[PDB]
Curated annotation (Swiss-Prot), chains A, B:
It comes from the Eukaryota. GO terms for molecular function: aryl sulfotransferase activity; sulfotransferase activity. InterPro entries: P-loop_NTPase, Sulfotransferase_dom. Transmembrane segments: none annotated. Sulfotransferase that utilizes 3'-phospho-5'-adenylyl sulfate (PAPS) as sulfonate donor to catalyze the sulfate conjugation of dopamine, small phenols such as 1-naphthol and p-nitrophenol and thyroid hormones, including 3,3'-diiodothyronine, triidothyronine (T3) and reverse triiodothyronine (rT3). May play a role in gut microbiota-host metabolic interaction. O-sulfonates 4-ethylphenol (4-EP), a dietary tyrosine-derived metabolite produced by gut bacteria. This is Sulfotransferase 1B1. Its EC number is 2.8.2.1. The gene is SULT1B1. The active site is at H106. 3'-phosphoadenylyl sulfate binds at residues 45-50, 128, 136, 191, 225-230, 255-257. It catalyses: a phenol + 3'-phosphoadenylyl sulfate = an aryl sulfate + adenosine 3',5'-bisphosphate + H(+); 3,3',5-triiodo-L-thyronine + 3'-phosphoadenylyl sulfate = 3,3',5-triiodo-L-thyronine sulfate + adenosine 3',5'-bisphosphate + H(+); 3,3',5'-triiodo-L-thyronine + 3'-phosphoadenylyl sulfate = 3,3',5'-triiodo-L-thyronine sulfate + adenosine 3',5'-bisphosphate + H(+); 3,3'-diiodo-L-thyronine + 3'-phosphoadenylyl sulfate = 3,3'-diiodo-L-thyronine sulfate + adenosine 3',5'-bisphosphate + H(+). GO terms for cellular component: cytoplasm; cytosol.
Amino acid sequence: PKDILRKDLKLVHGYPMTCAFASNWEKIEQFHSRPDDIVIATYPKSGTTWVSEIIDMILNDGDIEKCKRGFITEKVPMLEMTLPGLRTSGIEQLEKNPSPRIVKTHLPTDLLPKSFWENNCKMIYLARNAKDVSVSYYHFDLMNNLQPFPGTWEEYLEKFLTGKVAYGSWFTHVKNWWKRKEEHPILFLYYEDMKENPKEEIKKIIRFLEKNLNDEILDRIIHHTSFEVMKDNPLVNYTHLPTTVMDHSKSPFMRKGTAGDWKNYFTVAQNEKFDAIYETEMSKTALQFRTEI
Amino acid sequence: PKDILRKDLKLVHGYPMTCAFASNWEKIEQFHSRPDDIVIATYPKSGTTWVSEIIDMILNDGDIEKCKRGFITEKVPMLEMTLPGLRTSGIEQLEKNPSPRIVKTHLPTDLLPKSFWENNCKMIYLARNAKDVSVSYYHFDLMNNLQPFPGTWEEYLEKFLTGKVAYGSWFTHVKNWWKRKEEHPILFLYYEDMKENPKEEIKKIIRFLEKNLNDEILDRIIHHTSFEVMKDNPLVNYTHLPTTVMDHSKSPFMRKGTAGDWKNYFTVAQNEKFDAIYETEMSKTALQFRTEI
Ligand SMILES: Nc1ncnc2c1ncn2[C@@H]1O[C@H](COP(=O)(O)O)[C@@H](OP(=O)(O)O)[C@H]1O
Ligand SMILES: Nc1ncnc2c1ncn2[C@@H]1O[C@H](COP(=O)(O)O)[C@@H](OP(=O)(O)O)[C@H]1O
């Protein structure tokens, strides 16, 4: 463990990558998908864990005890995750998992195993406004010891803006995933929409996944996957991980679960600078993020 | 025409209704919706025409020339409108219109054709503060010859407060439509938010309508749907109606276009009596109206 903890990011295909995840990349590259695999793809801290539980519920017809068959890391493995000696890798877990497999990933489009495009796999891409992500990712690096130490918020926001963070730039991640939406079966969702109206957003996932679930099951999914519920659910709140991987005393994994929390952290000067870069990166795209609800 | 001009309101389902519209309700009740119809529903005088032009622009990807294919009454017909001999009825017009159809209505939730709920049609409900609505509706009755003469402003405000106006009580209208948003895909909007921040409000409509528009197109919609531009737009300013329907010389349809205009008409005595009725009607509800920005 001493060799992966708090280490510098390594570049893999031009992307800064968590040191623990950066070895044997050949295995990821060559991963074999099944045509009924369902990918949930997000930039980090964008609501992956939230929507993994929603999807597991949908696929289990809202049966909560089925959703309690294991920890989230077993039900919905992160494809690119490795912590050898400490944990089954994501791909090792996935090769033991029954179809249809839910696969979580934060990979950029050009790093996703091509098998997933080739098997025409259904994908849910979820995105969250860049300001809330930077704040959530900052606190994440406080508690997750696989990450480099983030420094001060001021130092961290500058790395985030220039893409000097694990998985690289949020702008490029979001823009390149959005572009793929035209030639693949990808449902593109916003975190803020899920926060404001989970029923209508969950219905989009239900239709995308070719399921019909009645209003009682839907209400149960909404209730089971609410922040207050999930935060106390020990199968999903990440307290099952070794303290050497995640120390929740520094920041809880389930932290605030809100839109607009970034305003508690951004100075007005940081905000002006951030808005200027954002307009440069995003004005020409059809993406329309909300930074509060 | 002399048969429907300046006539008393007629009761339909316990709602006072413009005499001209109070006929052939069977036709309205049995209207056939299409799954992609877009309902814009409002209490009268709440920004219907404004939001109609916005949605038309959104659906046409910001193409102003396409937005010039016809007058607003043809582009975005009023469902329950009938001016027989003088105008194609709203429903006749809708049955001539290609999908996706935008459908305008001031109908209370209980009078909306059932077909719209059954088809799961997207709806945008726009609401405006009750004081600005009352002033706006007063002025409208001056110019609109289908309406009864409203009397003095003092006599009119008393009818408004007691719901003795076409489409009945504003309080019931907004409360029941707000309740509905928990059971149907309904984007509920505030006139005063659109006025303060049209960019953000328009982004909600773009998302809700599942459209892909960049910032150039967005700024273009904001400009083309500003008050100053629309009031001079002969296709939306309602100057195409017969003088027998609308005499703009009494009061222009595109009247003031602002939040807070009510302060020019309300006496201090009226305002106290209004506020007391308001609190009785509205203090339980989660709605939050601004009377100025
Ligand atoms: N049920 C839920 N509702 C809302 N947000 C949730 C949630 N479950 C997790 N989250 C939030 O999603 C973010 C984590 O994303 P990921 O799973 O992609 O790591 C965290 O945000 P905050 O740090 O802003 O609280 C976390 O609190
Ligand atoms: N582009 C625009 N911007 C702001 N307000 C607008 C608008 N177009 C119309 N309105 C206002 O919407 C009201 C009429 O609404 P409806 O279309 O629902 O009858 C009028 O309010 P005022 O009488 O306060 O001017 C009108 O001036």
